Amino acid sequence: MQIFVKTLTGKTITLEVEPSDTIENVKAKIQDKEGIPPDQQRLIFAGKQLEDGRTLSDYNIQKESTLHLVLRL
């Protein structure tokens, strides 16, 4: 399924994922397509920062769900 990741600059990143994918795995995908190292990534969904060891399904992230991304400076 695809999910969307919006940055604070208006940019939208499209990802191919599965519900059982870990947040860490999602961060690696973002690194593949945007070059951003995983440890700089802060992912947000439904009012929460996403923890690396949980799954997309743990947060009810479904098909066409949109997350937000902030970078550590």
Partner 1 sequence: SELLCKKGCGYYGNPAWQGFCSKCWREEYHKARQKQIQEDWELAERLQREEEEAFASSQ
- Ramachandran category for residue 64: left, alpha or beta (phi over 0 → left; psi -120 to 50 → alpha): left
Binding of partner 1 by 70 (CB under 8 A): yes
Binding of partner 1 by 45 (CB under 8 A): yes
Binding of partner 1 by 33 (CB under 8 A): no
Binding of partner 1 by 54 (CB under 8 A): no
How many helices (H) and strands (E) in the chain? 1, 5
Return the SS3 of 47: coil
Out of 42, 51, 54, 57, point to the residue binding partner 1 (CB under 8 A): 42
Q: Which two tokens stand for residue 6?
A: 């919006």
Shortest CB 68 distance to partner 1, Å = 4
